[PDB]
Amino acid sequence: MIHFILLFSRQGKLRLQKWYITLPDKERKKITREIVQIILSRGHRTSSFVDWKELKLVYKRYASLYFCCAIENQDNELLTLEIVHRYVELLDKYFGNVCELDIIFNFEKAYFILDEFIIGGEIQETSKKIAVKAIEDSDMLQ
Amino acid sequence: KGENTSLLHP
Amino acid sequence: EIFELKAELNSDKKEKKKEAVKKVIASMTVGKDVSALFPDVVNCMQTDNLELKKLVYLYLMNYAKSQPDMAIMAVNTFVKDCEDPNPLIRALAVRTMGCIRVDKITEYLCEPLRKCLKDEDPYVRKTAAVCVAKLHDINAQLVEDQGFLDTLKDLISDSNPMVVANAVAALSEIAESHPSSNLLDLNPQSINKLLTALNECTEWGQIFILDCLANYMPKDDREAQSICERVTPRLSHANSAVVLSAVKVLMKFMEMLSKDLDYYGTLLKKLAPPLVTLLSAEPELQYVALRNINLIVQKRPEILKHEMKVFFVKYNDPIYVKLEKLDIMIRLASQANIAQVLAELREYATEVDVDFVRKAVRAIGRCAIKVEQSAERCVSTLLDLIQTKVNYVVQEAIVVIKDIFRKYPNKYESVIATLCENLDSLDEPEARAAMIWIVGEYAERIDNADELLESFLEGFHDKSTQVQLQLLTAIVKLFLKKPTETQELVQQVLSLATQDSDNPDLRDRGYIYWRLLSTDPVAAKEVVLAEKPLISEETDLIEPTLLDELICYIGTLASVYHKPPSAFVE
Amino acid sequence: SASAVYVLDLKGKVLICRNYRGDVDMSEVEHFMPILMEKEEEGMLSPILAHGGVRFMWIKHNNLYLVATSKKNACVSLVFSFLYKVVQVFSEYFKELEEESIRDNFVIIYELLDELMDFGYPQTTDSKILQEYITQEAPRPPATVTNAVSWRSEGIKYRKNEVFLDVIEAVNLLVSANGNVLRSEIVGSIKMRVFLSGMPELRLGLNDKVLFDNTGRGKSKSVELEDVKFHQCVRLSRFENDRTISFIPPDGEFELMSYRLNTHVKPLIWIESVIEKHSHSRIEYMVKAKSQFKRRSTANNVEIHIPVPNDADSPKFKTTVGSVKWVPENSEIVWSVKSFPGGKEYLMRAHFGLPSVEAEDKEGKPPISVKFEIPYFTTSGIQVRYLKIIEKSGYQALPWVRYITQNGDYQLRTQ
Amino acid sequence: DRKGGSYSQAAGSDSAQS
Amino acid sequence: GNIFANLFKGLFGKKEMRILMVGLDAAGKTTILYKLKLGEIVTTIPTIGFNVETVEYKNISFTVWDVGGQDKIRPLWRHYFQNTQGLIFVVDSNDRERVNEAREELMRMLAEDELRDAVLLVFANKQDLPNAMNAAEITDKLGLHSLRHRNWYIQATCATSGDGLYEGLDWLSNQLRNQK
Amino acid sequence: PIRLRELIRTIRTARTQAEEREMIQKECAAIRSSFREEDNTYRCRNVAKLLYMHMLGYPAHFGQLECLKLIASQKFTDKRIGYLGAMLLLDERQDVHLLMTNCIKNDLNHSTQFVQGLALCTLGCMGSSEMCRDLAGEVEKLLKTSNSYLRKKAALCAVHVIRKVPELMEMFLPATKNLLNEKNHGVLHTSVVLLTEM
Numbered sequence A: 001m002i003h004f005i006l007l008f009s010r011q012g013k014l015r016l017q018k019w020y021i022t023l024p025d026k027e028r029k030k031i032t033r034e035i036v037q038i039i040l041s042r043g044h045r046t047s048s049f050v051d052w053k054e055l056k057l058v059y060k061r062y063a064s065l066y067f068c069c070a071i072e073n074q075d076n077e078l079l080t081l082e083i084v085h086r087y088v089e090l091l092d093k094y095f096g097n098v099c100e101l102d103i104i105f106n107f108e109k110a111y112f113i114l115d116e117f118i119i120g121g122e123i124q125e126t127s128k129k130i131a132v133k134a135i136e137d138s139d140m141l142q
Numbered sequence B: 001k002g003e004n005t006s007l008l009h010p
Numbered sequence C: 001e002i003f004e005l006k007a008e009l010n011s012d013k014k015e016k017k018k019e020a021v022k023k024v025i026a027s028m029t030v031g032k033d034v035s036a037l038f039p040d041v042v043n044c045m046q047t048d049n050l051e052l053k054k055l056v057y058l059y060l061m062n063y064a065k066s067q068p069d070m071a072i073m074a075v076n077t078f079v080k081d082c083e084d085p086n087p088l089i090r091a092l093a094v095r096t097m098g099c100i101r102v103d104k105i106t107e108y109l110c111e112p113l114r115k116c117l118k119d120e121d122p123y124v125r126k127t128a129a130v131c132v133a134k135l136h137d138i139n140a141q142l143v144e145d146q147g148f149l150d151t152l153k154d155l156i157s158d159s160n161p162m163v164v165a166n167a168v169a170a171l172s173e174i175a176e177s178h179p180s181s182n183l184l185d186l187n188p189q190s191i192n193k194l195l196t197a198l199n200e201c202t203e204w205g206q207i208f209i210l211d212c213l214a215n216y217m218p219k220d221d222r223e224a225q226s227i228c229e230r231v232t233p234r235l236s237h238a239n240s241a242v243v244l245s246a247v248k249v250l251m252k253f254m255e256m257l258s259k260d261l262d263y264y265g266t267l268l269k270k271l272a273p274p275l276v277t278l279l280s281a282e283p284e285l286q287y288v289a290l291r292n293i294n295l296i297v298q299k300r301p302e303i304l305k306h307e308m309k310v311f312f313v314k315y316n317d318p319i320y321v322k323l324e325k326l327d328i329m330i331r332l333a334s335q336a337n338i339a340q341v342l343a344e345l346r347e348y349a350t351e352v353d354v355d356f357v358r359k360a361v362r363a364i365g366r367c368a369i370k371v372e373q374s375a376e377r378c379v380s381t382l383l384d385l386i387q388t389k390v391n392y393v394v395q396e397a398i399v400v401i402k403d404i405f406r407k408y409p410n411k412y413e414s415v416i417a418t419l420c421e422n423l424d425s426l427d428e429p430e431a432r433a434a435m436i437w438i439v440g441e442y443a444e445r446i447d448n449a450d451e452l453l454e455s456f457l458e459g460f461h462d463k464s465t466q467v468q469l470q471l472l473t474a475i476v477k478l479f480l481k482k483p484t485e486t487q488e489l490v491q492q493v494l495s496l497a498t499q500d501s502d503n504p505d506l507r508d509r510g511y512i513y514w515r516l517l518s519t520d521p522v523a524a525k526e527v528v529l530a531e532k533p534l535i536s537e538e539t540d541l542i543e544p545t546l547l548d549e550l551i552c553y554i555g556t557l558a559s560v561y562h563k564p565p566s567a568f569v570e
Numbered sequence D: 001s002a003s004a005v006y007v008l009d010l011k012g013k014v015l016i017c018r019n020y021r022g023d024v025d026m027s028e029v030e031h032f033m034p035i036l037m038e039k040e041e042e043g044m045l046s047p048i049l050a051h052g053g054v055r056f057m058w059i060k061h062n063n064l065y066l067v068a069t070s071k072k073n074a075c076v077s078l079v080f081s082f083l084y085k086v087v088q089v090f091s092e093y094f095k096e097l098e099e100e101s102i103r104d105n106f107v108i109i110y111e112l113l114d115e116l117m118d119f120g121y122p123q124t125t126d127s128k129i130l131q132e133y134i135t136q137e138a139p140r141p142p143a144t145v146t147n148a149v150s151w152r153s154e155g156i157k158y159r160k161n162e163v164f165l166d167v168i169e170a171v172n173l174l175v176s177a178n179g180n181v182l183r184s185e186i187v188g189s190i191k192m193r194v195f196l197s198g199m200p201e202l203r204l205g206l207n208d209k210v211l212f213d214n215t216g217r218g219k220s221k222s223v224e225l226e227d228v229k230f231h232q233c234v235r236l237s238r239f240e241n242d243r244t245i246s247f248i249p250p251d252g253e254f255e256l257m258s259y260r261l262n263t264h265v266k267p268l269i270w271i272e273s274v275i276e277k278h279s280h281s282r283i284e285y286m287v288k289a290k291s292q293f294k295r296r297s298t299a300n301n302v303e304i305h306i307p308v309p310n311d312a313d314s315p316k317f318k319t320t321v322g323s324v325k326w327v328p329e330n331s332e333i334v335w336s337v338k339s340f341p342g343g344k345e346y347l348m349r350a351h352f353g354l355p356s357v358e359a360e361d362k363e364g365k366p367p368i369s370v371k372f373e374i375p376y377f378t379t380s381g382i383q384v385r386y387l388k389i390i391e392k393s394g395y396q397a398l399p400w401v402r403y404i405t406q407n408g409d410y411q412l413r414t415q
Numbered sequence E: 001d002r003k004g005g006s007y008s009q010a011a012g013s014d015s016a017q018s
Numbered sequence F: 001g002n003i004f005a006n007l008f009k010g011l012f013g014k015k016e017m018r019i020l021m022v023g024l025d026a027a028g029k030t031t032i033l034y035k036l037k038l039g040e041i042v043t044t045i046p047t048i049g050f051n052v053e054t055v056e057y058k059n060i061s062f063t064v065w066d067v068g069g070q071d072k073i074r075p076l077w078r079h080y081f082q083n084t085q086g087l088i089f090v091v092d093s094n095d096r097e098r099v100n101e102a103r104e105e106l107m108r109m110l111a112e113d114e115l116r117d118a119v120l121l122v123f124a125n126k127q128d129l130p131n132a133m134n135a136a137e138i139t140d141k142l143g144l145h146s147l148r149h150r151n152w153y154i155q156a157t158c159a160t161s162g163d164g165l166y167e168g169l170d171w172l173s174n175q176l177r178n179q180k
Numbered sequence G: 001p002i003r004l005r006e007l008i009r010t011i012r013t014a015r016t017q018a019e020e021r022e023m024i025q026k027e028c029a030a031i032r033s034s035f036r037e038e039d040n041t042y043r044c045r046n047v048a049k050l051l052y053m054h055m056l057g058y059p060a061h062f063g064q065l066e067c068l069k070l071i072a073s074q075k076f077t078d079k080r081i082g083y084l085g086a087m088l089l090l091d092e093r094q095d096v097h098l099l100m101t102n103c104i105k106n107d108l109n110h111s112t113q114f115v116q117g118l119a120l121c122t123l124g125c126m127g128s129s130e131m132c133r134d135l136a137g138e139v140e141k142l143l144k145t146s147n148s149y150l151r152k153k154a155a156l157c158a159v160h161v162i163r164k165v166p167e168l169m170e171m172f173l174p175a176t177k178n179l180l181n182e183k184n185h186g187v188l189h190t191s192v193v194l195l196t197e198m
């Protein structure tokens, strides 16, 4: 399961954060700062994979804002990248031409979409249209 | 800026 | 962009040339490599407008090392400008000549430097003095060949106090890099002449004038008395650096002063108000003032004996200033202000700086160790802090108690019961080891010492090497003192540290303890539980040889870092 | 002995830099920001950084860090003095200290930086003198810089000769939580705004204890200033000989003398604060202010700052005199009073709730500070005697001065 | 008027000290 | 300022009021709340958390927040003290062993400096078995007369039927509301 | 009732970190004042602002009881905000989720498919050692249902409970029997994940 998923910008500002592991707030902040420093101090040919604290810290940002994942050492690495790409595509479809400005404005919607997509670090919606339809139906409820 | 750009450009 | 800028610069219109120069300056400041256009701006260099000449000179200076080959097309312009009637143009040309880091360029600039050495303009004299110093720093051999030392020496004996101060500073810098051979020292006449111009030098000229006296060594008391009398007015200057230089000069002169004469007492009385004034300076200079006070504290500690109220750290004081305030208070701690120091430390323990709290605990412990008259007060403060229910404060209090016990344990038997139950669940190696050592050495006033050591023996094989050694020592001491209730405990400790302990030093210590136990238990009391002598505390005072050298180095980088002048430069 | 003084920005961008010795590469400025971030994040941040064998000394300005790199064991105090002079010059020339002016006046900024210091040795520091040779909207350098009088420009002509003095008092009181005052120091400030014709040489005379004792008049009320620091125009020799305060006043507002001595008198304001803070239920602010100053004096714009709880909310104010406003930005209650006559006694009763959930970490106990400012009040009792205004041409001067008493380091330790 | 204490006229020297 | 709108609103009833529901577990608190809100005895599992509801009666919306009596939930009553103006206590007279624990919990909750404006509202639950005590024996055992500055009222209600609930509501309205 | 968008714009307009902290405190003062009054109309905007501030790095200890109060509310937006607050600022070491067990149990039998799914996701994200003990019975009840949109959520809740409580896996052996014929990809994936975890 994915221990934590956090959307951080290139300048260091974090646009998303979802940790599936219960940690102290100071410890969580320190871990996030260390992850940002490692990502901010990494090149473009580092393979986007880091084994930090025995955790598969996978970083792959498709724009200025980067994305990170932390899975245990028990599964394949390309699966995390595929899941990240699928989540990005689903978010773009739900929003429509997603940019950094809209991500901050749609933080609650982004959190709801992440909850409806992955729960507890495990994959919850394998299809891409069923999750979008469910999100639209939930939004239309009011 | 660099923030209004699409995440995937699709 | 670049092509358009080059075309604009290759035009005959001054209005577009000024705009192009401004754009080039903005691009370089914006972080654009405009050195590729340096040869293009070379043609548009000899201009009547003064605004564009400064920009061209700045671009050449900033684009001189990058394109040294293209800089060969600027000697003629500098030579032509070195005789301009306008003093500002001459000063700018002199400054730009020394700023060009070209090995083949300073060779052709010697003639203009020689011509401007006797320049009548005092600003021109200062500019030439700066250019000579820059050339000597770039090429000491070239400066020696040009014979500029005689001109620089003769500059101090001429009019223009600002130019004289600049020449003195240049001579000091040249001698600073020189190997001490052929030093520019002057007799008492030169010192008197400089003192006469000290009251006429500017704010920057005062520092340059006082720096020369830092190297001279007085040989007579009358000369020293006159120097002290002349430097006394320097303490009433609004310039903090001038005040610092004057204080350093006075301290250096005090090394030869006679304590029998009344000049030393007057100097000591006149120095405290200066220190008080400097202590209320800007935050940037507060650290410098604190470092200077600490450096001069070890030399004449009787000057600031009554200066204790000002040593308190302010609420808005910076972290660096707060840290220095505690060190200043510790260095100036005395039994007269013991209650005030304890009150300040008690107030300093309620702050939110964990590093600040640790520093306050260390300072309180140092004050308690230094003065035995407040040992009871320090113990009470430590007990109150432990009762404060602060984890870092608890560890600090445990460390302070452990340190105090080894120093003054004769009347420390009344705190074992209070410290017996003080939340021993803390896993800090500096606190757990200290508590174990205190229990082992003070295993007489606690009737449940064996029971307390039982909880610490669960993970003795994996606690720590120092912690394991301290626990083994405490167990051995308890067995030697009371072996009826710890007969099995000693055997268990020996089995755990001798069989399941893989530490080489720990294994050797356990083997030695087991051999002593199996050889003669009676002799173990006189061998292991012996009365140790007085503990020699680490003296925080610097070495006398280093203190004297640091006295001369006043206001430099070595005073803040507390390192030798040759131990910090590269 | 700084190698190059540069002006940085809050994002690490260098607004402007100017090398003076060239012994350090300009690329070292890039490593300054990460070093500062590490030092701040570890508590080791200091104004003087150190990148290997090169020390990066910087001070925090209004919006940028005035970083001055150096390589050798240069005079750190000299560097600080040069930085302070540069800051004063920038404030005089530019009314604002922000990025809007750093990128707006670079044409004159480069010239000012080149003229101020050369090869690490500062040369020009007179803002008025520098304004006569470097302007943003050039003639030969003025002879005043070359002449001995670099703080009084000759040839200045004015229709009238009016000088406005300022007797600024700074009441600093350090009252511990036990109720005793530890640090009670009063710093005098003799600042005059001189606007006359020519180069007058002020001959200052006041009611100093040392001067009265020397003249034999050490029986009346005389100020015994522990620290007396004259300005640049003040002649040190004259004061050292017989306390003769003779100096050429500058053109404009300047600080001539600044007294600094301890105070053994009662505080002008006696503030008694009470804290009936319930355990996560409510809090009480039993703040009582007693004016120990003379009844003939009024403290204008009195703002007694009382630190409220960090998570406190829904406050209720039950006071007697003075408006009370809770500012969430400062996280404290300011006992604001427009005019506070001497001897007044204002009682306040604060009452607010608290969240049920306890805080994870402590917040500390900041001291209570007041912002009282009572002008026309001389607590120290130092009385100015005369000001010898002498001009070579000869004119009748009409000097003016006002005595202002304000609150300085008047902090009260919380319980 | 002006806050901070009204400006007052000052003398030239200590007339009582000669 | 003008208060005409307040008078116009109060002409037809504006005051709402609040209420609290505290007591030990299995004391009929959930059933009592259901009867007050709905009017029927609804079987419910033990209250792990709490139940929040509102009831409109006598032109006053008396909001009721049920609080459990679990050992891990006993110290959580301090959270409900915030923004609380009323409180109703439900006793369990059928638990002789738990009577002392309930009395101790009531004394501990009554010793809070923040909860002072709320008067005592004792509800005599389980008033259907012969072992149930009267309206004075329970008060004497709990020492309700020794609560200084506390307006306590003892009322006995039967969970199965619902007798006396209207009397308790009227007494609470009279104690809180001080108008005609 | 300051909207979350206005707060985001105000934060983006702040330059200095001290200025950002001052603005955050100014907004938090109004948020705490509204919360202390027992406001129920604009509670969603306050919850969103508090979540944004907590993500920004400011303390949010006082904003815990409001999330609990909104969790047991009836509005869908309020329920979603409360679930988000419990998922973000609620943790096992927080100790404030103990009272949320009753709210979760009440919402476990809710007719709305969005409230039940949100509650299941929140329980899975914040699975505790004691909440799962009192919530294990409800998880198994929903595991035998025929809701395709809820089968994955039930499987995820069971997996989270098993990970948090390894001794509770004995009650899941007969619930997952004969579940390899699910046409939906999500239900089959959830069943496979549950089998692998077991």
Ligand SMILES: Nc1nc2c(ncn2[C@@H]2O[C@H](COP(=O)(O)OP(=O)(O)OP(=O)(O)O)[C@@H](O)[C@H]2O)c(=O)[nH]1
Residues within 6 Å of the ligand: F024, F025, F026, F027, F028, F029, F030, F031, F032, F042, F043, F044, F045, F046, F047, F048, F066, F067, F068, F069, F125, F126, F127, F128, F158, F159, F160, F161
């Ligand atoms: N037969 C009967 N039982 C009652 C009566 N009143 C209370 N009880 C018992 O009290 C218990 C209370 O259940 P609820 O009212 O639903 O919930 P509660 O009072 O809040 O108790 P907890 O949920 O455990 O905190 C019931 O299970 C009944 O067994 C009554 O009038 N008749």
Ligand SMILES: [Mg+2]
Residues within 6 Å of the ligand: F029, F030, F031, F044, F045, F046, F047, F066
């Ligand atoms: Mg119930």
